[PDB]
Amino acid sequence: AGGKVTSSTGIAPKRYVYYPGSEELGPDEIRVIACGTGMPTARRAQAAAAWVVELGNGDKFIVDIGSGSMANIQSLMIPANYLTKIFLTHLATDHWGDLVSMWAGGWTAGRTDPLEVWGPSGSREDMGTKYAVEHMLKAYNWDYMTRAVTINPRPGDINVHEFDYRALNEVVYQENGVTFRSWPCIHAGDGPVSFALEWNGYKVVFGGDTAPNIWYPEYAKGADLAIHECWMTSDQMMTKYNQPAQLALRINLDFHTSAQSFGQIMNMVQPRHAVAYHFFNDDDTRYDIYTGVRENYAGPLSMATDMMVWNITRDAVTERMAVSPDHAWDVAGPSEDLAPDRNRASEYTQYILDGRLNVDEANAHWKQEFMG
Amino acid sequence: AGGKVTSSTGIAPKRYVYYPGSEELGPDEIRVIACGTGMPTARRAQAAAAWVVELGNGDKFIVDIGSGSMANIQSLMIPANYLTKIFLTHLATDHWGDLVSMWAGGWTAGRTDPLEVWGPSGSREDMGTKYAVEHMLKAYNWDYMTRAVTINPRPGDINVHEFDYRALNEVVYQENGVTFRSWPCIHAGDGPVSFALEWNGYKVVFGGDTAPNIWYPEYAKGADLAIHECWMTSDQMMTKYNQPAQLALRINLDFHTSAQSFGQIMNMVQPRHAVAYHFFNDDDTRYDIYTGVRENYAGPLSMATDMMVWNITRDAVTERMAVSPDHAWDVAGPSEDLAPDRNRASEYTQYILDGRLNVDEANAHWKQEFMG
Amino acid sequence: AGGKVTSSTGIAPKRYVYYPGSEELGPDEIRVIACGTGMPTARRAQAAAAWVVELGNGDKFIVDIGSGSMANIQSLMIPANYLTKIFLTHLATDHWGDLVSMWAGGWTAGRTDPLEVWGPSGSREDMGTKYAVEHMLKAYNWDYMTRAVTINPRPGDINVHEFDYRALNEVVYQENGVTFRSWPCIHAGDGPVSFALEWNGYKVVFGGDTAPNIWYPEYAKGADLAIHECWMTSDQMMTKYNQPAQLALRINLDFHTSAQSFGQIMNMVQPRHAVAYHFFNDDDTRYDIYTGVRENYAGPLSMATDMMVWNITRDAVTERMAVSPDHAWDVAGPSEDLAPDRNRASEYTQYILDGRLNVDEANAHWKQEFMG
Amino acid sequence: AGGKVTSSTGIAPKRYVYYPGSEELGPDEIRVIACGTGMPTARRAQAAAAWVVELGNGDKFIVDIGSGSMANIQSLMIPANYLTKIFLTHLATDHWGDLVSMWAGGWTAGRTDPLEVWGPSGSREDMGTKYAVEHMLKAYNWDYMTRAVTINPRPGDINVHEFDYRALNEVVYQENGVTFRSWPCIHAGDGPVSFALEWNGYKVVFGGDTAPNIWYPEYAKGADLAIHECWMTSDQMMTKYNQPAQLALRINLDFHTSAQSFGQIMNMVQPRHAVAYHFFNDDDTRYDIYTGVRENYAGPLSMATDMMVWNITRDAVTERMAVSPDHAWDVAGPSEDLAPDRNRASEYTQYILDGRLNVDEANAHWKQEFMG
Ligand SMILES: [Zn+2]
Ligand SMILES: [Zn+2]
Ligand SMILES: [Zn+2]
Ligand SMILES: [Zn+2]
């Protein structure tokens, strides 16, 4: 497997797995990494929905940042300042639960710019992204104010770009030759959307969550990579949740996109490559889902799991698995020398500072050796 | 290793690893599981701070629920209704970021009771736990309102019990023979606390985060299990973070508890068993940290990592590793599922419902075969 | 998933994964564990071919013990004295390379009985099992003779039971109500066989390796569990190995059982449950292999990977994954307490014993503490 | 951690983990990878002893190839023809049990040259490496003869270079600027040796197994990297193996190098970097072992575990962990075409070949589609 090796002292070229941080991205290439493929139910094997997209022009984007996905994003060896633009398909915990971990952890990892978040409105103010993010920053006010004593506060801002959820395939983002468009989903209540990213002749579709709809098959047509939800079978719903037969039937017809519906949709879209996600991807679940899709779609298909990677080029759409560090650390990139604001008041009182324990004796041995 | 096997068709007794869901808890026993042992930066090897404590009287408590920890909590095969009481040392993201995943995922997993959260006040209303959780629920208003429409919303409430962070070893919880006391920490700004859990002649101390302070050595004295922050070394801060020598010195003398200070503290405490946590536990960091602790503390010691487990009995405190499923699922408990008493409004518009795709033909084959 | 929990202090019953050592085996039950499922190319995800069979009468068998499989067998928490009977399908390294790891490691562990090995003859003496094991013990003569100075020699023996590879469905083992039958395979050259284990109304078939043959479909009919080789697709052979189209075609037609041929064979066998193995079980290979099988076979089907487990009961054949310790240890069982044979010569010469380094002062501190 | 990133579309330089196949090797550099660090009992966390050494001149060597280690070696993305020179410290199963996997697997992975094996004699013919390997090839005669039928048998040759185990620090290999010397060990019986590899001003010492001896401290002096056996403690032999206090004592004095002895030895050697190996490296074993070393040795130290890597340069010896594929595949390098010009007889009889099942119909659909 992989490219042929030419030198004992050289590299293995065109490697059969993707080692994040090890590959230069070509000017006419896209890398997409599944940083979470799961559900609102937690599991180490699958974080909740998250996608990292890297373009050959140097721009990078996150599409969804569900609970648990930051451990996968942090394994990519990408400096924090390169991942400041986030797009949310909807305001479920499994699609933005880890925004707070990017916000706080990225600020500790030396991010010098504010985060920038694009997400949908709702039917009223308190159902949309601007309200959600305002209240998320209030929720973590203790952490904001205590960090801002010691670290310049500018990177702790989150600038929200709210867009109209109702718009049919309209632009929500345009910069540097990169466009994102949105169109609606049918999921739980008004607000959720799908995105299409367009850049340099490519189109990548991030379906988010939806029951089958008339918008995705039209607006996604001809995508280089098209992602859509694909549910566990009704039989598996009965096995794994002890659901009554008629509810397990409804889950796959009314609430979610069945494997067979996913296949009809992708047969309509005719992407270069389709991606099913948002199912538990296990030895006893994945084959009947794949069979369901294959009833109606014969084209190239990935059954997503965490750390699956797609390389999109003019000639190919290649699936690999990423092999990345579980013992991850932040990596440094370019940044400003951002100086703490001396004008900000201490968040300690003297009552707390008066409690310090004298540890001079126990630290003297290492302190002497380290200072010399 | 482990207990001696006596039968080919029997079990392996007193097993050398802990399989969660496989062991009964005796009435004079405590199990503590580290579900997160890391830092504000994410990595699959170590979730952020989180502890599950199981008492022989059937009561279970979570102390801290940092980002990434719910994937470890869900691996324990514990019904969601047994995990409704949560204690927060402080409002850092690495100590309660996954409360939202417990709230929404626990509800998906069949919790029927509200969550109950105990956490500190701050120096002002907006720096305290009540404000924090109130605004976390506003931040997730779209998810709450869309989940709630046709069910009893009861499991989606969070009842907060805020206590004065300044109180010196005062009772913040007293129920069914169990007490928790808090006392202050010195960490980032006013508000953080440590807990002591007392039950059935046992005392378990959850230090949270602190620079060395006069309170923990007094109020933790004689604990069966004493958990405290223990930082990476100044040499490691220079190696891993490229900190200047002076700042790397300060980190272990002013901001955090050095390994040497941790040893001093645990020599003062004389616990049955000490636990160091809140460092990256890697092959090139753990040994220099352990050495620093052993300068001043000779007693029983655990260098925590994720899914480490302590069994506390009258005669021993035993450290094991848990071996748990990465491909986790929720488990059902005694279900007390209550019908809604009240109509709520749909969060759909006809504009969105008008978008449903006809997928009848694609689903006809599985639908017919499944209905028979 | 799994059975309903009824107590906070109790167990999770009928668990959705198999924790080895945690479940009693019923008197009318079989457990089969795949301890290796791969190929002669090594990989941590898949040890070479190996199966552990546990019957409700207390008998346990290994069927094949390919390179890399002992790490999986050791993870089961089965005492060495319970796993002394080994059946080999054929003498490829990927079916008995880890016989030496079983031999040496169990001897150090406290195994007190010799290993017993059943395997096929070949077309001449040097192509059969008796010859193979005779020469393997001579190959490891250094390790045999040295270990036999300090550990009783009895468990260091290997007793071989060589059976005629040409026999059609003849008994090769019959003891305590368990029968093994063999029949021929078509694989590389003469000698390889398949096995059927019959006990207490159950039939388990271990196919070993073969191109499609007239014997398996007749002699395997109505097995409770039927295991057969199932190959990667010709398109996969071209992607992964850069084989030209003509050689890639011949691999699935002449040398190995294609997924489509597996499906035909299992359609003829009508087992309660079929197991496909001996292919690399990866995100970009597994789906098309399952697809191939489903062209011709619609019954219950497992796509094997390491540590998959089947429970065979009168009512069901259930697939689960095992969740088992990577940091494995031997578990003690019933064993004799045998002195070393003091009549055997030391294998040290005085030339070597003259080189001992005086380390008394370096070891005196711990030696004293440990003395008391 | 790691080098500073300079470009969004570039690499992360000087990475904090080693991704095998991703780094060029400099002409004044060595890489050593621990491909096995464990014991004669198996566990997925630790293969038995094995080391891969890569020199900046393009030469590569394997030192020991214990059971389980080939899954690690195959994860390095090294072509099989670059790994044909193997050095054995001794003929324990935990040091050469996977030679047969390298022989068979490396042949299916495309090796075109014979293996070349250097190993010690013993005190008589049947206790030496030449005897051992000749008998190993007989043991696997069925696999050899069936593989060889239509192909050049050249890669299936093993050329043995047996050296006198008694020699004190004499040359056993000298080619292309690389020298290996051997000297004796005191381990189980006569035969075991240690190696020193010298190249380009570097010295790397592979201790193999030994009780403390007068040879290693003299001949390993000033090594860049010195590897030596470092045993589990006597208290651990009692806890983990249920050994009586008197035997637990003897194991760390008579039979093995204690952690304290290891520290004495490395204090004598004064290497640039010491490596302790051959202990189970677990959360409850590693710290007491490390403490025992530090009684006597203060210098740079690694506590080996599998896939630990050292980069030896003029300015540093750097420890990292390797992050490599579990789902490993062979990689191609620069190859022969080979061509046999001696005949070999078929190993099939017509009795076996007449057993072929007709599967034409079941294979017709895929076969037609494919040929187009
Ligand atoms: Zn979702
Ligand atoms: Zn913290
Ligand atoms: Zn095979
Ligand atoms: Zn050894």
Author numbering:
A (entry chain C), B (entry chain D), C (entry chain A), D (entry chain B): 2 to 373
Sentences from the paper on this structure:
PNGM-1 is derived from a metagenomic library from deep-sea sediments that predate the antibiotic era. PNGM-1 has both MBL and tRNase Z activities and is considered to be the evolutionary origin of B3 MBLs. The wild-type of PNGM-1 has two MBSs in its substrate-binding pocket, and each is occupied by a zinc ion. The zinc ion in the first MBS (Zn1) is coordinated by the residues His91, His93, His188, and Asp210; the zinc ion in the second MBS (Zn2), by Asp95, His96, His279, and Asp210.
His91 and His93 coordinate the zinc ion at Zn1, whereas His96 and His279 coordinate that at Zn2. In the H93A variant, the electron density for the zinc ion at Zn1 is weak to allow only a partial occupancy of a zinc ion or a full occupancy for a water molecule. The residues His93, Aps95, His279, and Asp210 occupy equatorial positions along the enzyme’s surface. In the structures of all PNGM-1 variants, except in that of H96A, the electron density corresponding to the catalytic water remains despite the complete or partial loss of a zinc ion. Each MBS of PNGM-1 is formed by four metal-coordinating residues, and the substitution of only one of these residues dramatically reduces the metal binding affinity of the enzyme.
